[PDB]
Amino acid sequence: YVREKVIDFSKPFMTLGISILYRKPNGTNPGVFSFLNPLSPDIWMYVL
């Protein structure tokens, strides 16, 4: 709109819009220690 007053345009040959860009948010590395003992291992060796 601020560029409409100063210069003129043709028809838009294609339509676009504003989109948001981000990394593909996987962030997930499951393992042995996360699923086995998510608690303190001091508790586990006290149980031992």
Added chain:
Amino acid sequence: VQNIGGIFIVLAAGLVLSVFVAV
């Protein structure tokens, strides 16, 4: 002794009493 580790002292006291009472 953690947030769930507070039962260990009661376990140790009960084990000492179970050793001392039985024979």
